[PDB]
């Protein structure tokens, strides 16, 4: 049965505001030799095509180990940093898959508080995998929804706002609301004052305005059909969700 000695450390992939992550290799059968991402430290075991998979979970005194998929494709922030902005084609694909994974987490009563390009990883194929979720009861200020800035609540709706921020950042290379310091940024989010860059298609602009509604109740995704509201938006017209789910759609970018 399970034990940290069953995994040899290869490299310290990194560390966040909630632990450290290592690239490990299991030395015990039946998956001996297999590479995994080990995190050392709230529902953590989710099964979905676009949500990172938890393979093992054990507690070594003082800390809890989490063995997850090792995603080789890096993160969206890193790729954004290099490309400075994605084409709408690429954005539509990444956001479509994120929509499915996000809606699924929601069904499980999970709020994706830390939604941002940094937490969206790509596998060797190019399909995304959401990571660092699991919070049911609760960061990067630029991605905070207005009801969250004003501590007026934090529901599934807040995730759709953040989803809109991610779309804007991937399409323009810039954040929609940002000031000189955290305080100015929070104040800018509250006004929900937004200039639409002119190179954005009318479909993209429409989806963005629907997502950036100050009131969580009028924001796209706030029922009745919930997530279906967004999946049925004209921006995703050319998207076949069935095949997307089956990872049938060929990703724009490959690593
Ligand atoms: N399953 C996985 N496969 C490959 N890399 C992973 C991974 N889980 C995390 N990482 C990577 O590990 C390093 C740090 O992850 P980490 O979760 O601590 O911070 P982050 O950059 O993702 C900020 P945050 O703390 O907000 O999540 C990052 O380079 C991240 O891309
Ligand atoms: Mg992460």
Q: Is 243 exposed, middle or buried (0-12, 13-18, 19+ CB in 10 A)?
A: exposed
Burial of 34 (0-12, 13-18, 19+ CB in 10 A): middle
103 and 161 share one domain: yes
CATH code for the domain in which residue 146 is found: 1.10.510.10
From the list 157, 151, 154, the residue with the least C-alpha distance to 218 is 157
Give the ligand 1 atom nearest the CA of 71.
3
**146 and 31 in a common domain:** no
How many C-beta atoms lie closer than 10 Å to residue 124's C-beta? Answer: 11
* Residue 161 and residue 96 in one domain: yes
Q: Is the CB of 132 under 6 A from ligand 1?
A: yes
Helix (H) or strand (E) holding 156: helix 156-172
Ligand-binding site membership of 201 (annotated):
no
Experimental method: X-ray
Domain holding 30, by residue range, is: 1-74
CB 101 within 8 A of CB 247: no
Clarify whether residues 156 and 60 are in a common domain: no
Centroid of ligand 2 to alpha carbon of 120 (angstroms): 7
Q: Which two tokens stand for residue 199?
A: 């190179």
Q: Classify strands 63-68 and 54-60 as parallel, antiparallel or unpaired.
A: antiparallel
Looking at residue 75, the DSSP 8-state letter turns out to be: B
Number of domains in the chain: 2
Are residues 131 and 160 both part of a single domain? Answer: yes
Say how many C-beta atoms besides its own lie within 10 A of residue 202's C-beta: 10
d(CA 240, CA 219): 24
Going from the Cα of 223 to the center of ligand 1, the distance in angstroms, rounded, reads 32
Task: State the DSSP code for 53.
Answer: P
Q: Is 154 in the same domain as 203?
A: yes
Ligand 1 within 6 A of CB of 100: no
Classify 30 as helix, strand or coil.
Answer: coil
CB 146 within 8 A of CB 190: yes
Q: Cα 185 to chain center, whole Å?
A: 21
Q: Is 81 left (phi over 0), alpha (psi -120 to 50) or beta?
A: alpha
Of the ligands numbered here, which is closest to the C-alpha atom of 10? Answer: 1
The answer to whether residue 31 is catalytic is no
Domain end marker among 47, 74, 101: 74
Residues 88 and 180 in one domain: yes
Does ligand 1 come within 6 angstroms of the Cβ of 14?
yes
Q: Strands of 61-200 (E only): list them.
A: 63-68, 120-122, 128-130
Residue 165 in marked binding region = no
What spacing in Å lies between the alpha carbon of 201 and ligand 2's midpoint?
31
Residues 147 and 79 placed together within one structural domain of the fold: yes
Strand, helix or coil for residue 201: coil
Assign residue 14 the CATH number of its domain.
Answer: 3.30.200.20
Give the end of a domain, one of 36, 53, 74.
74
Whether omega before 30 lies within 30 degrees of 0, making that bond cis, reads yes
Q: Which of 9, 10, 11, 14 to mutate to test the pocket of ligand 1 (most atoms within 8 A of CB)?
A: 14
Same domain, residue pair 51 and 118: no
Of ligand 1's listed atoms, the one at least distance from the Cα of 131 is 8
In this structure, the answer to whether residues 6 and 120 fall within a common structural domain is no
Q: Which of 27, 58, 74 is the last residue of a domain?
A: 74
| 219 and 148 within one domain | yes
Verify whether ligand 1 is closer than 6 Å to residue 122 (CB atom): no
The protein residue with its alpha carbon nearest to ligand 1, atom 4, reads: 71
First vs last Cα of the chain: how many Å apart? 35
Are both 174 and 80 inside the same structural domain? yes
**With a 6 A CB cut-off, is 149 part of the ligand 1 pocket?**
no
């Amino acid at each position: 049965k399970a034990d940290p000695s069953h995994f040899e450390l290869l490299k310290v992939l990194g560390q966040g505001s909630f632990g450290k992550v290592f690239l490990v290799r299991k030395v015990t059968r039946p998956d001996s030799g297999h590479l995994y991402a080990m995190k050392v430290l709230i529902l953590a075991d989710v099964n979905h095509p676009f949500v990172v998979k938890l393979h093992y979970a054990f507690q070594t005194e003082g800390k809890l180990y989490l063995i997850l998929d090792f995603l080789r494709g890096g993160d969206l922030f890193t790729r954004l940093s290099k490309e400075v902005m994605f084409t709408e084609e690429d954005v539509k694909f990444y956001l479509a898959e994120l929509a499915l994974g996000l809606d699924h987490l929601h069904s499980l009563g999970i709020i994706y508080r830390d939604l941002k390009p940094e937490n969206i990883l790509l596998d060797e194929e190019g399909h995304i995998k959401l990571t660092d979720f699991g919070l049911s009861k609760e960061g990067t200020v630029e991605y905070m929804a207005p009801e969250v800035v004003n501590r007026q609540g934090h529901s599934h709706s807040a995730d759709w706002w953040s989803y809109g921020v991610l779309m804007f950042e991937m399409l323009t290379g810039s954040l929609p609301f940002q000031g000189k310091d955290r305080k100015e940024t929070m104040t800018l989010i509250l006004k929900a004052k937004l200039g639409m860059p002119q190179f954005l298609s009318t479909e993209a602009q429409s989806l963005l305005r629907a997502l950036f509604k100050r009131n969580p109740a009028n924001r796209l995704g706030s029922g009745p059909d919930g997530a279906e509201e967004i999946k049925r938006h004209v921006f995703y017209s050319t998207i076949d969700w069935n095949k997307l789910y089956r990872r049938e759609i060929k990703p724009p970018f490959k690593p």
